[PDB]
Amino acid sequence: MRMDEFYTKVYDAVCEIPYGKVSTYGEIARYVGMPSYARQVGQAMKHLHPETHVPWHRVINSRGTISKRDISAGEQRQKDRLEEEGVEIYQTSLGEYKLNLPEYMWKP
DNA sequence: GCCATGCTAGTA
DNA sequence: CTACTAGCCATGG
């Protein structure tokens, strides 16, 4: 399966995530038949263009947190986008932004 | 070819 | 709950 196919598949999936809901790299990976490629779902996201109709903000990690960026602290920009969709987000004891995954996670 | 970068399940 | 590890895998130098 071509990388550009994957990349397409992924975006297709993300866009299916309803307003106010969320998903995760892994789940998306599995959704589109590429279970081991969670990191690459990362990649996909990171490669979109800032002015995109894609709900990249609806995608977080397995642990229900928002993931630190080795480049570009717009993880802030991700929290904000969620709070508008109405999403209780708590900084963990450390400065991590967490949320009640079971409550928010989405499934077709 | 190697080696650094940039999610997750499992174990302690 | 927090660590820390093993394994994963495209991408670019």
Side-chain angles (χ1 to χ4, degrees):
Chain A
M1 162 195 250
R2 230 128 36 68
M3 263 328 91
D4 67 82
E5 270 181 301
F6 180 61
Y7 281 35
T8 310
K9 313 291 285 300
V10 169
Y11 299 146
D12 286 322
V14 191
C15 293
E16 298 168 37
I17 314 206
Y19 181 117
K21 279 295 170 181
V22 321
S23 206
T24 68
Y25 308 154
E27 264 312 346
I28 300 310
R30 281 186 298 262
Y31 190 47
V32 306
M34 287 282 154
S36 63
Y37 280 46
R39 313 200 68 158
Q40 345 297 320
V41 196
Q43 291 195 185
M45 300 312 108
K46 177 182 186 179
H47 283 156
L48 294 150
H49 282 124
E51 1 61 70
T52 165
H53 270 167
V54 171
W56 54 268
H57 55 283
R58 315 217 241 279
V59 191
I60 71 171
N61 64 40
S62 69
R63 287 161 40 253
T65 107
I66 294 188
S67 2
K68 285 63 59 196
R69 316 295 207 263
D70 293 344
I71 333 171
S72 167
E75 75 185 40
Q76 215 59 221
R77 181 200 187 203
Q78 182 174 19
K79 172 219 180 192
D80 221 348
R81 294 275 279 261
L82 278 152
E83 286 221 305
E84 289 141 310
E85 312 213 350
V87 148
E88 193 69 289
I89 281 173
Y90 53 105
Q91 311 82 31
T92 192
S93 57
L94 187 128
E96 221 143 1
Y97 307 172
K98 194 160 162 219
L99 66 67
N100 204 262
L101 202 42
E103 164 184 349
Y104 283 122
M105 171 82 44
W106 169 73
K107 28 256 208 165

